[PDB]
Design a protein around this ligand. Structure first.
Ligand SMILES: Nc1ncnc2c1ncn2[C@@H]1O[C@H](COP(=O)(O)OP(=O)(O)OP(=O)(O)O)[C@@H](O)[C@H]1O
Ligand SMILES: Nc1ncnc2c1ncn2[C@@H]1O[C@H](COP(=O)(O)OP(=O)(O)O)[C@@H](O)[C@H]1O
Ligand SMILES: [Mg+2]
Ligand SMILES: [Mg+2]
Ligand SMILES: [Zn+2]
Ligand SMILES: [Zn+2]
Ligand SMILES: [Zn+2]
Ligand SMILES: [Zn+2]
Lengths: 143, 224, 651, 598, 49
């Protein structure tokens, strides 16, 4: 948990991120409801296999699950751009920037141009250890 | 400070075989030197293992001063000393160091794997459920290290005949970060590096290799 | 055939199936009405005994009574090494109308038959001749397609002739013709020729029997040259509302680099339709095809133009009879006036403008000042026509535009600075940014006609300074840095300030061009209107007579001969005449509001004198040439009607 | 068991014979002594003169010239055996052969598909050079399906994996891992050149091709150099499509997919192994040399002694005898502007600007400029453009440019992305090709204010800074500016100051050391003299140029003299202050006003 | 499924089921052949096919 100051220079449109999803199997139509989503910039890999079994009946396909969009608990979701406060930048020196991730009531609390102090979890993006040049082991940071 | 500066003149004067081995295979030699420095420090200070648990050795006053325009494939995997002007510098980034993974099929935390500078560590199976399936970084149990890329070009005074200055990327790790600044004139000691993930295999042209310098020692040229 | 190699023809495309079909349940090609045997024999009959019974000129070899016109050409192919026979399709049309109809309709099947026939005839005789490959026939002068927009899908893969101006030529593209392979195991090598546009990789070596071990080795393979040409078509039929057309040409192996941008050319080739991929990285193609010409032949000659630089440099362009006739013309006392009057015959008594334009068509002596540190001297003559409207300046510019090869026409605000020099576009056939020349480079060895010179902003008129002084166009743009050649003649037409000459203002006040720019022109013709009733009557009769009712070829050949052979050099007494003339003209032009003379007008005089000596076929510049240079320079600007204080009045 | 290239093996043995038997006028085996130098690290290329190869074995030279690409690896093997026994070399050190002195030269337009793979010499102007990279020449791979190791697969100017796994009951053709620590590399540089302006046909833009430099030739050609590349024209596989499909390559095994696996579409093309055959022409240069060399003796740093050694004894005796030449000032002025009558002051000023002063740096850090900038202002047709043309044709490292024809990125520097790596390549502009040279800006007053800013920055601080496209890079611009400017109204009004006659910004005018006003006096005697000079030049072209010194002689002399850094004596210091006092005094009250203030 | 062009969204692995009524079946018998008793060597088990 870090506490940093800064000025906000960009504020994305508020969008919808799921907190709970439900997935349905393409063949047997059975659902796998209320899967909890990790908060932040973290994704989810769907199960590659249907839970339901009926040995007399044949099995479902390999990747059978489809997000049911109406059975999904979505929350508000905003991404901000924090710049180092102009009075905090060393003299001959480019300012530092930080990406911020807001959620549910922290959305639209600030507008670009505000001087803020943030409390948040200094975190990396966990979208699946993929998207491979020079920097190895580097994952994008955000608060 | 978790970093010990060793003068190459002193090392060569005392023991010349290590000094002669040092710039030929510096990855291994610096690994050995780091282990020995940790031992000597822990012997001298028993309570310092809870401070850093890794001592970095920085080689100083290396006599192998090559200007940026003169690095070749001959220099690959060797400890070189160069000088130049820092033109760019990323922010300090966190890089995985001892990465713990989550098996997101059974939630077992896959034990710490060393992150080399050369390739992404990708786990195989999960020790418990034996899934090859997707993993994710456990970012709470992972330990990270500081990372920073700088671009260093030849000082404009040195490039002289009428020709363009040459630049190299350098990677500063964990103590060397924020030791430079765009505009600084520095002395860079590091391993001229070839083998990570940049080789132009995409038929986008000739099979050329991108090179980087793994900075081992940075010495600014100014007052403090 | 003498064992001489029979090189493949990329201009005919990839080979087809070539199925032979018997029409009885005689042995035509499938889908055609040609059988190879009868076509071959017909063409042999044509080569052996064809005589043009109406054409006698510009052969220089053609006995034109001797039974073959074309086996004389075969004799030439024996004397020179080039294995190409250019057959005029009109000759085939005369001899065998059905053979002509077959040729333009199935060129890919008929032209190779023509090749076999020609090589059989040629190596019948000349049986000890050696040729780097067998003779390839190039039919040209098919029935001209007036508008290439009129071509239908019925015309795909047929032989057509079109004309236009070369706009852009690509870099040379290497096309594979025969692939080379080695086994990675045993180093056994093999070669595979293109078959219908693809190479079948060996897939097992015949030596060590290893599957998929032969590797294609590109730089041991055999390649051919290819070149893309953008040609702006020049249709003879221009239906209402149709915008100009750019056609893609592909030249191969030997027609590569045969035309330069700004060249006007008649191109004969095959009308091709090709599929377009939807992305460069997939194999789906669109239903709507795109078209190009596979170039078979370039014809540079045009009856209504002057000879191009490629022609003039050709050693056998004139028969001895022609050269003697031209020299006999040069001995005429008034050859200057005759040649001038032959220009723009429909324009009434602008004799001095026409003499100046004649000198511009001849031009001054190209000089190599390279060892003098001086730089490059401009041998081109730049004429400015300044006069009040309705005086036929645009008609003169249009006439010169329609007469020279390598010309450009620009008017007013329609041109920009980068549109005259050069710019970058993205070729929409390669998805690559390529550099395109503008009007001033497309006329690099020709005349650029700038109309409405005055109604043209100073931004684009500064581009003209370097072109008119140094014949080069230095561009320092974002990435591309070079010096394009712009050795153009400039024929400019402009109106006075207030668009009409008013007599209360001096010449300088009334032309109103930057005074450094006026010195670049070596003739400023003041096309002023005398309020003269006699001239009104004579011009009225000329113009009305124009509503109810010297050769060109001789003028064309005269100018070509003068450009080829005559390099006038200054004589000592001409040198002295020039010194005196410059001093005098500088005294004269130092008056109040007259166009002054600078050391640049001495070189103007030198250029005009050299051009005039070249009109005489002189090879030596003499006092008469300098005298005519002075007279032309004075008559333009009306310096006899100019007082050293004020403007002019009337002649 | 193994097929042997008979012609290549024969050529290899003949070349080793040439290496170990050819002897020079001294009677000693010259390439033995030359390859003695080749035991060094950073030293891997023997330069073999083709005239020697011609004299020693005509047939071997013909074979090398005609089949250069295929026999070049064997010439390199011959060089390796030549240097192997005679010395103690690292076992795995490759050596390269760099032929030089080919008699015939080809045009860039004549680089057709007939010259592919055979030895040629071309000349061009270097447009830009890219970073040196390690190139993979032959990689060793690992099969990911059976863990066998495929060794030494040759890279054909493209990353090539093995065609097939070595294990026959493993027909892997896709999954390979490059063992980069066992592969071998070469030093690679790509440079872009374009055809020289004396070679252009009519109406055409210069053709550019990219030439490839390897191990030791790698850094020889710099931007702006008129260099002379000898090597081989080669095809390189290309990525250019969306045109009509053409020239495919598919397997010749007659293979048809079953129901549900039909050989159609993407699957069918992958299974038949079809791939487009697209190539582009690249020049693979083994040697680089200037087209018009300055010296005949040699070609890292520059000191007067290094220059003196770099030239032959005849050349330096010439340099010395003009250095001892009294009246050398007038001799150089006349020898360097032979066709220009009058304007002796302008000739002297331009000559001095060519020599330049001593650049110095203060203890605190400010640099004291040492480059003379000269502006020529004058009436129409007073030979301003001629002065600029004279310098531009004489001086090496001289750029010519006009007023509006140049942009700002084209005047100073641009950045384009390196397609081979993550690096960035700087596209040099006029003010950088003229580094340690002269930038002749013509039509200076008509040159855009947004570009006048770039000119002023380079004039005042001798450097150009780039912050574009992803890189910051500071560049050296130690040019001297030689400018020509028209007066306002086209004519110089002697009743106004220089400031009131030209529309140059004051900062620009201040960065000019000398301002030469060329007024056109309407004088009959000078009209006569100019007329005689012009008409004489046009009468006797090559003649009427009797310069006491060759222009190459001046080039060598000037290059040598630029290494001198004169000091200032104490009496010279006192004289300087006294003359400055006089110069200031010429600018006081009472006396007539001067054109600009001191 | 080879027809994954009549729509962008895709079919699964192993989408195919035999259509029993659309199959053309033919008759089918298996026989056991024993060596002829006169052809079996004297002390010897018979061969089968
Ligand atoms: N001396 C002449 N001889 C022949 N035709 C003439 C002459 N004077 C005028 N004409 C006719 O009058 C018309 C003049 O138009 P044209 O465009 O040639 O003049 P212009 O000088 O270009 O005019 P502007 O200055 O307005 O551009 C033309 O149709 C031309 O045929
Ligand atoms: N003093 C002189 N001596 C020799 N030639 C001259 C002189 N003055 C002018 N000229 C001639 O005038 C011509 C035009 O000069 P140019 O260099 O274009 O002048 P500017 O560009 O200054 O107007 C040149 O070819 C030059 O030969
Ligand atoms: Mg008009
Ligand atoms: Mg000028
Ligand atoms: Zn299911
Ligand atoms: Zn698990
Ligand atoms: Zn084999
Ligand atoms: Zn394998």
């Amino acid at each position: 948990l870090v506490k940093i100051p800064g000025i906000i220079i960009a504020a994305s449109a508020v969008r919808a991120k799921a907190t709970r999803i439900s997935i349905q199997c393409r063949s047997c139509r059975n659902t796998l409801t209320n899967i909890a989503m990790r908060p932040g910039l973290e994704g989810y890999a769907l199960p590659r296999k249907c839970n339901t079994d009926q040995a007399g009946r044949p099995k479902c396909p390999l990747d059978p699950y489809f997000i049911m969009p109406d059975k999904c608990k979505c929350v508000d979701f905003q991404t901000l751009k924090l710049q180092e406060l102009p009075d905090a930048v060393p003299h001959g020196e480019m300012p530092r920037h930080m990406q911020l991730y807001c959620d549910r009531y922290l959305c639209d609390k600030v507008v670009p141009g505000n001087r803020v102090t943030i409390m948040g979890i200094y975190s990396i993006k966990k979208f699946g250890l993929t998207t491979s040049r020079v920097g190895v082991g580097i994952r994008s940071s955000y608060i | 400070r978790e970093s010990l500066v060793v003068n190459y003149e002193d090392l060569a004067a005392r023991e010349h075989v290590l000094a002669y081995f040092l710039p030929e295979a510096p990855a291994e030699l610096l690994q050995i030197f780091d282990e020995a420095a940790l031992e000597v420090v822990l012997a001298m200070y028993p309570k310092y293992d809870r401070i850093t648990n890794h001592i970095h050795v920085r080689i100083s006053h290396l006599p192998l001063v090559e200007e940026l325009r003169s690095l070749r494939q001959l220099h690959l995997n060797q400890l070189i000393r160069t000088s130049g002007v820092v033109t760019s510098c990323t922010g300090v980034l966190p890089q995985l160091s001892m990465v713990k993974y989550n098996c997101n099929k059974c939630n077992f935390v896959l034990g710490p794997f060393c992150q080399s500078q050369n390739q992404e560590v990708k786990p195989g199976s999960c020790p418990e459920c034996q899934s090859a399936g997707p993993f994710e970084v456990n970012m709470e149990e992972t330990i990270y290290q500081n990372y920073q890329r700088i671009r260093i070009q030849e000082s404009p005074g040195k490039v002289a005949a009428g020709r363009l200055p040459r630049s190299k990327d350098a990677i500063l790790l964990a103590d060397l970060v924020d030791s430079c600044k765009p505009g600084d004139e520095i002395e860079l000691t590091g391993i001229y590096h070839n083998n990570y993930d940049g080789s132009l295999n995409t038929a986008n042209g000739f099979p050329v290799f991108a090179t980087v310098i793994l900075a081992n020692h940075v010495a600014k040229k100014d007052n403090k | 055939v003498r064992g001489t190699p029979v090189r493949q023809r990329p201009d005919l495309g990839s080979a087809q199936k070539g199925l032979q079909v018997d029409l009885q349940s005689k042995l035509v090609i499938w889908g055609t009405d040609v059988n190879v045997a009868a076509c071959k024999e017909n063409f042999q009959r044509f080569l052996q005994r064809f005589i043009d019974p109406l054409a006698k000129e510009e052969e220089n070899v053609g006995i034109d009574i001797t039974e073959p016109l074309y086996m004389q050409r075969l004799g030439e192919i024996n004397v020179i090494g080039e294995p190409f026979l250019n057959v005029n399709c009109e000759h085939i049309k005369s001899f065998d109308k059905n053979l002509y109809r077959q040729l333009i309709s199935y060129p890919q099947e008929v032209i190779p038959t023509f090749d076999m026939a020609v090589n059989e005839i040629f190596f019948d005789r000349y049986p000890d001749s050696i040729l780097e490959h067998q003779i390839q026939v190039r039919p040209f002068n098919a029935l001209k397609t007036k508008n290439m927009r009129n071509l239908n899908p019925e015309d795909i893969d047929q032989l057509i002739t079109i004309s236009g101006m070369v706009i852009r030529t690509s870099q040379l593209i290497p096309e594979m013709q025969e692939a080379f392979f080695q086994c990675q195991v045993c180093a056994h090598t093999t070669r595979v020729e293109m078959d219908r546009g693809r190479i079948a990789e060996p897939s097992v070596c015949g030596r060590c029997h290893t599957t998929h071990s032969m590797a294609l080795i590109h730089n041991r393979s055999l390649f051919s040259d290819k070149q893309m040409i953008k040609l702006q078509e020049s249709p003879e039929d221009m239906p209402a509302g149709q915008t100009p057309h750019t056609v893609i040409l592909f030249a191969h192996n030997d027609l590569v680099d045969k035309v330069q941008p700004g060249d006007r050319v008649n191109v004969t080739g095959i009308y091709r339709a090709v599929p377009i991929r939807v992305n460069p990285r997939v194999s789906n193609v669109k239903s709507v095809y795109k078209t190009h010409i596979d170039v078979i032949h370039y014809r540079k000659t045009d009856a209504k133009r002057l000879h191009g630089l490629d022609e003039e440099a050709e050693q056998k362009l004139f028969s001895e009879k022609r050269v003697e006739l031209l020299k006999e013309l040069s001995r005429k006392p008034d050859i200057y006036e005759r040649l001038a009057s032959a220009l723009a015959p429909s324009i009434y008594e602008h004799e001095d403008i026409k003499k100046g334009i004649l000198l511009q068509l001849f031009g001054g002596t190209r000089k190599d000042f390279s060892h003098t540190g001086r730089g490059k001297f401009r041998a081109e003559i730049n004429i400015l026509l300044c006069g009040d409207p309705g005086t036929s300046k645009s008609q003169l510019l249009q006439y010169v535009y329609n007469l020279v090869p390598r010309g450009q026409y620009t008017s007013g605000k329609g041109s920009s600075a980068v549109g005259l020099t050069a710019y970058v576009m993205k070729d929409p056939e390669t998805r690559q940014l390529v550099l395109q020349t503008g009007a001033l480079v497309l006329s690099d060895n020709g005349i650029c006609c700038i109309d409405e010179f005055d109604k043209m902003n100073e931004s684009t008129r500064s581009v003209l300074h370097e072109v008119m002084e140094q014949q080069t166009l230095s561009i320092a743009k974002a990435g591309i840095i070079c010096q394009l050649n712009a050795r153009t003649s400039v024929l400019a037409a402009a109106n006075p300030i207030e668009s009409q000459w008013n007599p209360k203002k001096t010449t300088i006040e009334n032309i109103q061009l930057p005074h450094t720019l006026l010195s670049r022109f070596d003739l400023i013709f003041l096309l002023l209107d005398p309020q003269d009733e006699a001239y009104d009557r004579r011009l009225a009769h000329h113009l009305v007579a124009l509503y109810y009712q010297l050769d060109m070829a001789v003028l064309k050949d005269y100018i070509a001969y003068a450009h080829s052979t005559i390099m006038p050099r200054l004589s000592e007494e001409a040198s002295q005449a020039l010194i005196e003339a410059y001093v005098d003209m500088r005294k004269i032009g130092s008056s109040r509001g007259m166009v002054s003379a600078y050391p640049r007008q001495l070189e103007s005089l030198i250029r005009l004198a050299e051009a005039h000596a070249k009109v005489r076929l002189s090879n030596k510049v003499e006092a008469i040439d300098v005298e005519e240079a002075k007279r032309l320079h004075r008559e333009a600007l009306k310096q006899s009607a100019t007082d050293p204080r004020t403007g002019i009045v009337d002649i | 068991l193994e097929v042997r290239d008979e012609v290549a093996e024969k050529c290899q043995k003949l070349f080793l014979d040439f290496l170990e038997e050819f002897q020079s006028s001294d009677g000693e085996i010259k390439y033995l002594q030359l390859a003695e130098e080749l035991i060094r690290p950073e030293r891997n290329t023997l330069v073999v003169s083709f005239v020697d190869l011609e004299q020693f074995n005509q047939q071997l030279s013909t074979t090398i010239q005609e089949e250069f690409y295929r026999v070049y690896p064997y010439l390199c093997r011959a060089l390796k055996t030549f240097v192997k026994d005679r010395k103690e070399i690292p076992l795995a050190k490759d050596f390269y052969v760099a032929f030089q002195d080919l008699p015939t030269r080809h045009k860039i337009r004549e680089l057709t598909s007939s010259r592919i793979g055979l030895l040629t010499r071309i000349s061009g102007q270097v447009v830009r050079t890219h970073p040196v990279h390690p190139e993979l020449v032959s990689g060793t791979f690992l099969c990911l399906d059976c863990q066998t190791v495929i060794r030494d697969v040759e890279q054909q100017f493209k990353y090539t994996q093995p065609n097939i796994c070595r294990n026959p009951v493993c027909a892997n053709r896709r999954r390979f891992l490059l063992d980069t620590n066992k592969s071998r590399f070469v030093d690679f540089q790509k440079v872009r050149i374009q055809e020289t302006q004396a070679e252009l046909p009519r109406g055409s833009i210069p053709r550019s091709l990219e030439v490839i430099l390897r191990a030791e030739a790698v850094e020889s050609a710099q931007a702006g150099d008129k260099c002379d590349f000898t090597g081989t024209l080669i095809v390189v596989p290309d990525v250019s499509k969306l045109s009509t499909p053409g020239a495919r390559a598919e397997t010749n095994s007659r293979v048809s997919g079953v129901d549900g696996y039909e050989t159609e579409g993407i699957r069918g093309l992958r299974a038949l192994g079809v791939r487009d055959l697209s190539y582009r022409l690249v020049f693979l240069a083994c040697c680089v040399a200037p087209t018009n060399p300055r010296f005949g003796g040699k070609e890292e740093e520059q000191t007067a002694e290094s220059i003196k050694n770099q030239m032959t004894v005849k050349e330096w005796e010439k340099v010395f005898e003009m250095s001892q030449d009294k009246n050398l000032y007038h001799n150089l002025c006349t020898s360097l502007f032979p066709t220009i009558h009058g304007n002796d002051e302008v000739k002297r000023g331009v000559l001095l600007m060519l020599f330049g002063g001593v650049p110095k740096t203060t203890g605190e850090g400010t640099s004291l400029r040492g480059d003379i900038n000269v502006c020529i202002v004058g009436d129409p047709s007073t030979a301003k453009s001629q002065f600029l043309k004279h310098v531009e044709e004489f001086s090496p490292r001289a750029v010519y440019t006009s007023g509006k024809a140049s942009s700002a990125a084209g005047l100073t520097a641009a950045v384009v992305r390196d397609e081979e790596s993550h690096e960035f390549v700087i596209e040099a502009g006029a003010l950088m090709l003229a580094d340690n040279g002269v930038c002749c800006i013509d039509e200076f007053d008509k040159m855009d204010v947004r570009d006048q800013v770039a000119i002023h920055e380079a004039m005042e601080q001798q450097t150009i800074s780039i912050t574009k496209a992803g890189v910051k890079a500071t560049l050296n611009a130690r040019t001297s500016i030689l400018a020509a400017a028209n007066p306002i109204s086209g004519h110089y009004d002697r009743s106004k100051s220089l400031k009131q006659n030209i529309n140059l910004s004051a900062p620009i005018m201040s960065r000019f050391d000398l301002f030469f006003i060329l007024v056109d006096e309407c004088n009959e005697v000078t009209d006569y003299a100019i007329a005689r000079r012009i008409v004489d030049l046009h009468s006797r072209i090559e003649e009427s140029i009797d310069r006491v010194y060759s222009l190459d002689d001046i080039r060598r002399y000037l290059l040598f003299a630029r290494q001198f850094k004169p000091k200032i004596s104490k009496e010279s210091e006192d004289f300087i202050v006294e003359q400055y006092k006089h110069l200031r005094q010429r600018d006081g009250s009472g006396v007539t006003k001067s054109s600009w203030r001191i």
